[PDB]
Design a protein around this ligand. Structure first.
Ligand SMILES: Nc1ncnc2c1ncn2[C@@H]1O[C@H](COP(=O)(O)OP(=O)(O)CP(=O)(O)O)[C@@H](O)[C@H]1O
Ligand SMILES: [Ca+2]
Ligand SMILES: [Ca+2]
Ligand SMILES: [Mg+2]
Length: 1020
C-alpha cells in the first residue's frame, strides 16, 4: 500500500482482502508476518559516545578550566618545542581531572540509559485486533501486528501502527500527534480519502500514525504499514531534544556556580594585586613583566584550584545513580534531573480510580425499583458473587439463588449494561485469565451481564473464549446500536441510541453515568414493566441507598442506569459538540443502579503513612462521588475512621463556591477532592503551586493528563492510559505505589550528596586560598608554586570529590519535613562551617610551612622575625648571620605545605559522608568509593614524592617518617574540628561503630608521642 490516504476504504480493504467485521485469518497473518516481519523498531543508540562526552564539557566551570589549560599551554611557549615533561606538565594535570570527571559522568549516564532501556521491555505493549480465530476483539502483542488486520484504537491508547481509518464508533475522534507533527493540539480525524498524493502528515486526516495517542473517541481501521515503514520509524533517527522545565534545584546550582565564578575571579585578581610590589625582584628574572607572568600564572592556577569543576560531573552522577536505583524498583524516569523533585515535594495529589485502587472492579451489588406507591416505595436489591473479571459468579436476591424469569427489570438492566458498553472481555490463554478490553467500569458491567444471563443462554459447550462475551452477544443481536453519545466528564454520562432489527419507530436510548447526575434528569421510574412518574421520596431513597453503598465496608463505586423511551431521530439531533449531548439525555426513566468494588492497593495504606512521616501531605483528586472518595480515604489512611471531614473533603462545586479565604484554607487543609473534572483537577494543582508548594501528581487516566503536566512531577501507572504516561515524568511499571516513597528518599539523598560535595569543596578550597593569603600577610616565602597548586587540585578536587556522589543515605532522611525551595542553597551555619574548616586548613598549611623553618630538627632554627623578613636576608645585614637566602627557597617547606594540604583535604573528605552524623556513627567504609579514591590520591602523592624523576618536576623533596608524623599531627585535628561542629549542629541546632574506634584510636595514640611548638609568634 503506497498511498493509503488517497484510496477509498473499500480499496484499502480489498488490497489485503480483509473484512472489518471478521478480520485477518491466521494463514494471512502468517504470510504477512513472513513478508513484513515484526512490528517493532530496532534498538538504536540513544546518545553517541562522542556526543555523551562532548555534553560533559558544556558547563561554565569546565569551560573556564579548558580556557585555563589553553592559557597554561600557550604561556609555556617560551621555547618552540624543546620540552615535553618539564614545561607542559601544568596543562596535562589540568586536563587529567577534566578527563576523569568526564569519564565518570559518561559511565554513570550510560549505565542509567542502559537500565532505562532494559526496563522499557518490562511489559510488552499490546494492541486490540479483530482476527478470524475469535469473533471478538482480542489483545495481541503490538509487535505481532502485520499490515492488513483490523485494529480498534479505543481512546486512551497509543496507536500501534500506521492505520488507515475505516469507521469511527464515537461521534468524533481527536488524536494527539505532537510526537510526529509537532502540533500541541488534538487533531480531528475522518474516514474520507484525501485527494493529495503528496500530502504532509498534517493533511492525512484519515490516517493514524504509530506512536501517537488518542485524545478522544473510539474508532477502528486497517493497518497499512508496520515496523520501519511507519512514519515514526522513518524519522526515528531525526528528532529534536526538549528540556522539560529546568528543575528548581538546577537553577539554584547554576546561579551558585556563577556567583562562585565571580567570587573566584575577584579572589584571583586580589592575589595578583597584593603581589604588585615584588615584581622587580631578581628572583623572577629581574624584570617587571617577568614577575607579572609568574603571578598571573599563580592567579590562574589558584582559579583552577579553587573552582569546583567537578560540580556538573557529580550532579550528573548523582542523577544517574538515582535513575538506576529507581529503575531497579521498576520506575522509568524520563529525564535525569526529575529524580530530585520528589525529594522536595510537599504535596502529593493522587487520582483515586486506577492509581490508589487496583482498578480491578467487579459489580458486587445492584438494585431495581420493586414498587412505588406515591409517598412509599420498595426496592429490589441483589448481590453478585465474584471479584474478578471471570463470568462465573452468581446473583443472589436475599442470599438465595435468583430464579430464571422472576424480575423483569433485570432484563432491562442487563440490556443497558450490555448495549451502553464500549469495553469487552478477553481470555488470555497464556495466563488463563479474563482481562478488560477498554475501561474497568464497562468491563465490570460486561462481566455482570455475563453473570446474570437474563435470557438463559446455554453455556455448556462454550470454550473459555466463547464464554467471555456470550450473553453480551445474545443481547446485542436483539437491537441495532445506531450511534453512541460518548462519555464526557462534564456531563458524567454516556448514551447509546438503539433501534430494532426489523424496521417496525421503536427506538430507545440507553444512558449510564454518575448516580446523582443521571437521577436529576430522570423524570420516570421503571417498576417491572410499568413506567410511573418519578417522585421525591423515591429520589431520596435511591440516593440514600447509593450513599449507604459508597460509605459502607465495601466502599462501592456506583453508577446509575436510565432509558430514554421517546428520543429524537438522528436527523433532528445536533451532535457537533459534546455540550449538546446532555440536551438529549433528558426526561429519562430510571431503571436501576450498580455498585462495583475496586479495592485499594495494599502498598498504599503503608506508603501514605510514610509520606505523612516525611512531612508530605497526600490529597485525593477524583471524579467519583464524595461518599466513596471519603470512604477510600479512610481505608487507606488519609482520614481517621472517625475523623470529622467537614472542612477537609470538598467537591468541585463546593470548592468553586468558596471565598478566597476559605478557598486558600482548603488547599492547605483539605485532603480529598471529589467530583472534579480534569480542568478542576489541574486547577487544584495550580492553586497548590500558587501557595508556593512543590506538587507531585499521580494518575492513570486521561482526566489526569492535564494535571500531570501542571505538577512539578507527574507519576503515571504502568497499567494506565498511554496519554497519562506521555504527560508524566516517572512511570511506575509494576504499579507499586510504595515506589513513590523510595523516589522521595532518593531525591532527598541526591540533595544531601550535592550538599556534602559543596561542603567538602568549599571548605577545602577556601583553605587553599587562606594559605596563600596568610603567607602573603605574614610575609613568609610562597608555600606553593602554580604546578603544586594544580597538583593539589588534581589530587583533592578529583575522584575524592566525585566519590561523594556515592554516599549512603542518612538514617533520619525520611523523618524530616521537606526542604523549602525558597530557602537559600547555603545556610549561614553552613557558611560558618565552611569558613571554620578553611581557616584551620590554611593556618595548618602555613604552620607546616613555617614549622620547618623555625622548629625543625633537620631544617634551620630561624626565628619569626628573620622568617617574616626573609627578603632582607643579606650577608651585610647585621641581624642575618648563620643563615642565607638559599634556605628560604628550599623545597622542603613547599613539600611540607603541599603534603599537609593534600592530607588535610583527604581527612576533610572523610568529614563529608554526612552533614551531622559523626564518623563513629557513619564510618568511612560506608562509602567504599571514597576510601578507594582517598587511597588512590595518597598513592599518587607518594608516587610523585619518591619516584626518581618526579620531585624535580614538582620542585619537591622526599620526606622522611619524622616529617610525615608532623604532617599527620597537623592534618588530623580537622577531623575533630568538624566533629565538634557536627556535635554543635546536632544538639544545639536540631550506637557508635566500635570496630572503627578500636582501629583509629591506636593510630591517634601512636601519632601523638611528643610536642614541638614554634618560637615567638608575634603577628600570629
Ligand atoms: N464509561 C462511563 N460511562 C458512564 N459513566 C462513567 C463512565 N466512566 C465513569 N463514569 C462515571 O462518571 C463519573 C465521573 O467521571 P470520571 O471519569 O472522572 O470518573 P473516574 O472513573 O475517572 C474516577 P478517578 O478520577 O478517580 O479516576 C464517575 O463517577 C463514573 O460514575
Ligand atoms: Ca578545582
Ligand atoms: Ca581542592
Ligand atoms: Mg483514575
Amino acid at each position: 500500500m503506497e498511498n493509503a490516504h488517497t484510496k477509498t476504504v473499500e480499496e484499502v480493504l480489498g488490497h489485503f482482502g480483509v473484512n472489518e467485521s471478521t478480520g485477518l485469518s491466521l494463514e494471512q497473518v502468517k504470510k504477512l508476518k513472513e513478508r513484513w516481519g515484526s512490528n517493532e523498531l530496532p534498538a538504536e543508540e540513544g546518545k553517541t559516545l562522542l556526543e555523551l562526552v562532548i555534553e560533559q564539557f558544556e558547563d561554565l566551570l569546565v569551560r573556564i578550566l579548558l580556557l585555563a589549560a589553553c592559557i597554561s599551554f600557550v604561556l609555556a611557549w617560551f621555547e618552540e618545542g624543546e620540552e615535553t615533561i618539564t614545561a607542559f606538565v601544568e596543562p596535562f594535570v589540568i586536563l587529567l581531572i577534566l578527563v576523569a570527571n568526564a569519564i565518570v559522568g559518561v559511565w554513570q549516564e550510560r549505565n542509567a540509559e542502559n537500565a532505562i532501556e532494559a526496563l522499557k521491555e518490562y511489559e510488552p505493549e499490546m494492541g486490540k485486533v479483530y482476527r478470524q480465530d475469535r469473533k471478538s476483539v482480542q489483545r495481541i502483542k503490538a509487535k505481532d501486528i502485520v499490515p492488513g488486520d483490523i485494529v480498534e484504537i479505543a481512546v486512551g491508547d497509543k496507536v500501534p501502527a500506521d492505520i488507515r481509518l475505516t469507521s469511527i464508533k464515537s461521534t468524533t475522534l481527536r488524536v494527539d500527534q505532537s510526537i510526529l507533527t509537532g502540533e500541541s493540539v488534538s487533531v480531528i480525524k475522518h474516514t474520507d480519502p484525501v485527494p493529495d498524493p503528496r500530502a504532509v502528515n498534517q493533511d492525512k486526516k484519515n490516517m493514524l500514525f504509530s506512536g501517537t495517542n488518542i485524545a478522544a473517541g473510539k474508532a477502528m481501521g486497517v493497518v497499512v504499514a508496520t515496523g520501519v515503514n511507519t512514519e515514526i520509524g522513518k524519522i526515528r533517527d531525526e528528532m529534536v531534544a526538549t528540556e522539560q522545565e529546568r528543575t528548581p534545584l538546577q537553577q539554584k546550582l547554576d546561579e551558585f556556580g556563577e556567583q562562585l565564578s565571580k567570587v573566584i575571579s575577584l579572589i584571583c585578581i586580589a592575589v595578583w594585586i597584593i603581589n604588585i610590589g615584588h615584581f622587580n625582584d631578581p628572583v623572577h628574572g629581574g624584570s617587571w613583566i617577568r614577575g607579572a607572568i609568574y603571578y598571573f600564572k599563580i592567579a590562574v592556577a589558584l582559579a583552577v584550584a579553587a573552582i569546583p569543576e567537578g560540580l556538573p560531573a557529580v550532579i550528573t552522577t548523582c542523577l544517574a545513580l538515582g535513575t538506576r536505583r529507581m529503575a531497579k524498583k521498576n520506575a522509568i524516569v524520563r529525564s535525569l534531573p526529575s529524580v530530585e523533585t520528589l525529594g522536595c515535594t510537599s504535596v502529593i495529589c493522587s487520582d483515586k480510580t486506577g492509581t490508589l485502587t487496583t482498578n480491578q472492579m467487579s459489580v458486587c451489588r445492584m438494585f431495581i425499583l420493586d414498587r412505588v406507591e406515591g409517598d412509599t416505595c420498595s426496592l429490589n436489591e441483589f448481590t453478585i458473587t465474584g471479584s474478578t473479571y471471570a463470568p462465573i459468579g452468581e446473583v443472589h436476591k436475599d442470599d438465595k439463588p435468583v430464579n430464571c424469569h422472576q424480575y423483569d427489570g433485570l432484563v432491562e438492566l442487563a440490556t443497558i449494561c450490555a448495549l451502553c458498553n464500549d469495553s469487552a472481555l478477553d481470555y488470555n490463554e497464556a495466563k488463563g485469565v479474563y482481562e478488560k478490553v477498554g475501561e474497568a467500569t464497562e468491563t465490570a458491567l460486561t462481566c455482570l451481564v455475563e453473570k446474570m444471563n437474563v435470557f438463559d443462554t446455554e453455556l455448556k459447550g462454550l470454550s473459555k473464549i466463547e464464554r467471555a462475551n456470550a450473553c453480551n452477544s445474545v443481547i446485542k443481536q436483539l437491537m441495532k446500536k445506531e450511534f453512541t453519545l460518548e462519555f464526557s466528564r462534564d456531563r458524567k454520562s454516556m448514551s447509546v441510541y438503539c433501534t430494532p432489527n426489523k424496521p417496525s419507530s421503536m427506538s430507545k436510548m440507553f444512558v449510564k453515568g454518575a448516580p446523582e447526575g443521571v437521577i436529576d434528569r430522570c423524570t420516570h421510574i421503571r417498576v417491572g414493566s410499568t413506567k410511573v412518574p418519578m417522585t421525591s421520596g423515591v429520589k431520596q431513597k435511591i440516593m440514600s441507598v447509593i450513599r449507604e453503598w459508597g460509605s459502607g465496608s465495601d466502599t462501592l463505586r456506583c453508577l446509575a442506569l436510565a432509558t430514554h423511551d421517546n428520543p429524537l431521530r438522528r436527523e433532528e439531533m445536533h451532535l457537533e459538540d459534546s455540550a449538546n449531548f446532555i440536551k438529549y439525555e433528558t426526561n429519562l426513566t430510571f431503571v436501576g443502579c450498580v455498585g462495583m468494588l475496586d479495592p485499594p492497593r495494599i502498598e498504599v495504606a503503608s506508603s501514605v503513612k510514610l509520606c505523612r512521616q516525611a512531612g508530605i501531605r497526600v490529597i485525593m483528586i477524583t471524579g467519583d462521588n464524595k461518599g466513596t472518595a471519603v470512604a477510600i480515604c479512610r481505608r487507606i489512611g488519609i482520614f481517621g475512621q472517625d475523623e470529622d471531614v467537614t472542612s477537609k473533603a470538598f467537591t468541585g462545586r463546593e470548592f468553586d463556591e468558596l471565598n478566597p479565604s476559605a478557598q486558600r484554607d482548603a488547599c492547605l487543609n483539605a485532603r480529598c477532592f471529589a467530583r472534579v473534572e480534569p480542568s478542576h483537577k489541574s486547577k487544584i494543582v495550580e492553586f497548590l503551586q500558587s501557595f508556593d508548594e512543590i506538587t507531585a501528581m499521580t494518575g492513570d487516566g486521561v482526566n489526569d493528563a492535564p494535571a500531570l503536566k501542571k505538577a512539578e512531577i507527574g507519576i503515571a501507572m504502568g497499567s494506565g492510559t498511554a496519554v497519562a504516561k506521555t504527560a508524566s515524568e516517572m512511570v511506575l511499571a509494576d504499579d507499586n505505589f510504595s515506589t513513590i516513597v523510595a523516589a522521595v528518599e532518593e531525591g532527598r539523598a541526591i540533595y544531601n550528596n550535592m550538599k556534602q560535595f559543596i561542603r567538602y569543596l568549599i571548605s577545602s578550597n577556601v583553605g587553599e586560598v587562606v594559605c596563600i593569603f596568610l603567607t602573603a600577610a605574614l610575609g613568609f616565602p610562597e608555600a606553593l608554586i602554580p604546578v603544586q597548586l594544580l597538583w593539589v587540585n588534581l589530587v583533592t578536587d578529583g575522584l575524592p570529590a566525585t566519590a561523594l556522589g556515592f554516599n549512603p543515605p542518612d538514617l533520619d532522611i525520611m523523618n524530616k519535613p521537606p526542604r523549602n525551595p525558597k530557602e537559600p542553597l547555603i545556610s549561614g551555619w553552613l557558611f560558618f562551617r565552611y569558613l571554620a574548616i578553611g581557616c584551620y586548613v590554611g593556618a595548618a598549611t602555613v604552620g607546616a610551612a613555617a614549622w620547618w623553618f623555625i622548629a625543625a630538627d633537620g631544617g634551620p632554627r630561624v626565628s619569626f622575625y628573620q622568617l617574616s623578613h626573609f627578603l632582607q636576608c643579606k650577608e651585610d645585614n647585621p641581624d642575618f648571620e648563620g643563615v642565607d637566602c638559599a634556605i628560604f627557597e628550599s623545597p622542603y617547606p613547599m613539600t611540607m605545605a603541599l603534603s599537609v594540604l593534600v592530607t588535610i583535604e583527604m581527612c576533610n573528605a572523610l568529614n563529608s559522608l554526612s552533614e551531622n552524623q559523626s564518623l563513629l556513627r557513619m564510618p568511612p567504609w560506608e562509602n567504599i568509593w571514597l576510601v578507594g579514591s582517598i587511597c588512590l590520591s595518597m598513592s599518587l602523592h607518594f608516587l610523585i614524592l619518591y619516584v626518581e624523576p618526579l620531585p624535580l618536576i614538582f620542585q619537591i623533596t622526599p620526606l622522611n617518617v619524622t616529617q610525615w608524623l608532623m604532617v599527620l599531627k597537623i592534618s588530623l585535628p580537622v577531623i575533630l574540628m568538624d566533629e565538634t561542629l557536627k556535635f554543635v549542629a546536632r544538639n544545639y541546632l536540631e550506637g557508635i561503630s566500635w570496630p572503627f574506634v578500636l582501629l583509629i584510636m591506636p593510630l591517634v595514640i601512636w601519632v601523638y608521642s611528643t610536642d614541638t611548638n614554634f618560637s615567638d609568634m608575634f603577628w600570629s
